[PDB]
Design an enzyme around this catalytic site. Structure first.
Site, short mmCIF file in Angstrom:
data_model
loop_
_atom_site.label_atom_id
_atom_site.label_comp_id
_atom_site.label_asym_id
_atom_site.label_seq_id
_atom_site.Cartn_x
_atom_site.Cartn_y
_atom_site.Cartn_z
N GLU A 283 -5.01 -5.77 10.32
CA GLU A 283 -4.01 -4.74 10.62
C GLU A 283 -4.41 -4.14 11.97
O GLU A 283 -5.35 -3.36 12.05
CB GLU A 283 -3.92 -3.65 9.57
CG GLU A 283 -3.58 -4.15 8.17
CD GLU A 283 -3.21 -3.04 7.21
OE1 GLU A 283 -4.16 -2.42 6.68
OE2 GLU A 283 -1.99 -2.80 7.00
N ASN B 245 0.86 -1.21 0.00
CA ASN B 245 0.00 0.00 0.00
C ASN B 245 0.88 1.24 0.00
O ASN B 245 1.41 1.57 1.07
CB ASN B 245 -0.90 -0.09 1.24
CG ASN B 245 -1.87 1.10 1.32
OD1 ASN B 245 -1.89 1.93 0.40
ND2 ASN B 245 -2.63 1.15 2.39
N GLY C 281 2.08 2.27 11.06
CA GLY C 281 3.08 3.30 10.92
C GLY C 281 3.82 3.71 12.18
O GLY C 281 4.53 4.72 12.17
N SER D 50 3.43 -2.13 10.41
CA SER D 50 4.86 -2.12 10.64
C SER D 50 5.55 -3.41 10.20
O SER D 50 6.60 -3.71 10.77
CB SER D 50 5.20 -1.85 12.11
OG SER D 50 4.61 -0.57 12.45
N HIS E 20 -9.67 0.13 4.58
CA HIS E 20 -8.44 0.49 5.30
C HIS E 20 -8.74 1.34 6.53
O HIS E 20 -9.69 2.13 6.47
CB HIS E 20 -7.48 1.25 4.38
CG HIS E 20 -6.12 1.31 4.98
ND1 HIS E 20 -5.75 2.28 5.89
CD2 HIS E 20 -5.05 0.50 4.80
CE1 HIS E 20 -4.49 2.05 6.24
NE2 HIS E 20 -4.05 0.99 5.60
N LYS F 5 0.05 4.24 -0.04
CA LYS F 5 -0.68 5.34 0.59
C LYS F 5 -0.47 6.63 -0.18
O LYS F 5 -0.35 6.56 -1.41
CB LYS F 5 -0.29 5.46 2.08
CG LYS F 5 -0.58 4.12 2.80
CD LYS F 5 -0.45 4.30 4.31
CE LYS F 5 -0.44 2.97 5.04
NZ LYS F 5 -0.65 3.17 6.51
N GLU G 267 -7.45 3.93 7.66
CA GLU G 267 -7.41 5.36 7.38
C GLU G 267 -8.71 5.86 6.75
O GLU G 267 -9.14 6.99 7.01
CB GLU G 267 -6.20 5.72 6.51
CG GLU G 267 -4.92 5.64 7.36
CD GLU G 267 -3.69 5.23 6.58
OE1 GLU G 267 -2.72 4.75 7.20
OE2 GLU G 267 -3.73 5.36 5.35
#
Lengths: 247, 247
Positions: free
Chosen positions: A164, A9, A170, A210, A94, A11, A96
């Site tokens: 995830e 991904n 991150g 990560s 996702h 992003k 986000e």
């Protein structure tokens, strides 16, 4: 059995030049025959990305699309447009988008149903927050997210699930291999009650949060972990090390 | 005088085939020397569209973008990406994003400041709903939408404002040329009060909302109507007639 899957991904990152470098690296690095790699650049670069791939193990996916294929929806991406330029997957749900863009469970389920129906594969993202974990609710959260989708989607053949943990995205601190394995097996058992033992056994469940070139090999003996959804490390040379981590 | 400006918002529509048809029609069309045309395809086709344009009056714009240029924002577009493939504008604040995607006034202002900051032009959309129209709130609403942008942005050199009669969309109302002239004149006078009369006389204010090759000519003589933000007609051959409507 379950083919190892590594998604990338990007992003909101990348340029024509930097994506060129990334794809050229994959084309000439040696990667296993038995791996599926899906790179997911911003929509602006989807066509260009497909045009550069010179290895059958590598395909391209989009980072989001809407739940209609065309119409008066300014600013959205369409799964038909994604197909038209030669991409094969879309990421849906996702963390986000669920948080910054208020995409709820049903919206994600409707989008999944729509994308599958149009012949595009789905990388379906699920996972819990640090507060939810701390209260023992990891499984209750992920089964809610999956149950919402299962009320609209009954065949996961062209679905890949990415677990995830939100608190691992991150930060540089992934979940331990051991914990991933245990949650992954719990997800797979829950899903076998819904889709059947056979589909459950064939469904890829990816770890994301990560994952990097350094720690990818520490998950190699975890039988219910079938690959990774890689964010930041997908922009870097070590993406190749992750793809080769079970060589 | 203000340079005639015609934007074409393709919305969620397009394919490599249709984009080729649209752009090669423009390339060899007779159009006025000084018009500015901005075609806005889906992000998936921005680069391909730029590569096909062979007409100085025509540039390419995006339909939306985020308020940062890079980072962990899966699914968004970036003004630096738009710039990288040679597009020059972004649409911000379109009614379909304000409604369906809950983009608030301040969100839009932050995006506007950021895009202009990165050297990309903005097509800034404003407009009231039917319910707002009937409550007598037309100017209250567009002043509130604009004042939020003015909190962040006072240099409208690289901005065009598009007024969207959202109250005329499927509602059985028509937005007449005289209707449009009065509201455009009112918006201009409000912006003169905030930006001064020179800035206000240089600002293009565009008509948006059920505009075609038949009715475009009916706005020819309206002083404060400086162009169009075209929807569905922008997919069609008649978009050329709109560009030539003041001939």
């Amino acid at each position: 059995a379950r083919t190892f899957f590594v998604g990338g991904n990007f992003k909101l990152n990348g340029s024509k030049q930097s994506i060129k470098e990334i794809v050229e690296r994959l084309n000439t690095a040696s990667i296993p025959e038995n791996v599926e790699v899906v790179i997911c650049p911003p929509a602006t670069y989807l066509d260009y990305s497909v045009s550069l791939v010179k290895k059958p193990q590598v395909t391209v996916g989009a980072q989001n699309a809407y739940l209609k294929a065309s119409g008066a929806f300014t600013g959205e991406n369409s799964v038909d447009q994604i197909k038209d330029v030669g991409a094969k997957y879309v990421i849906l749900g996702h963390s986000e988008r669920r948080s910054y863009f208020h995409e709820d469970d049903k919206f994600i389920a409707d989008k999944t149903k729509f994308a599958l129906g149009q012949g595009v594969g789905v990388i379906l993202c699920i996972g819990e927050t640090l507060e939810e974990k701390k209260a023992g609710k990891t499984l209750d959260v992920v089964e809610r997210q999956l149950n919402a989708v299962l009320e609209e989607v009954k065949d996961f053949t062209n679905v890949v699930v990415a677990y995830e943990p939100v608190w691992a995205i991150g930060t540089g601190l992934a979940a331990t291999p051991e914990d991933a394995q245990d949650i992954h097996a719990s997800i797979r058992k829950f899903l076998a009650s819904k889709l059947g033992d056979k589909a459950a056994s064939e469904l890829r469940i990816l770890y994301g949060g990560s994952a990097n070139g350094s720690n990818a090999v520490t998950f190699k003996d975890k039988a219910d972990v079938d690959g990774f959804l890689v964010g930041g490390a997908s922009l870097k040379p070590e993406f190749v090390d992750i793809i080769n981590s079970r060589n």
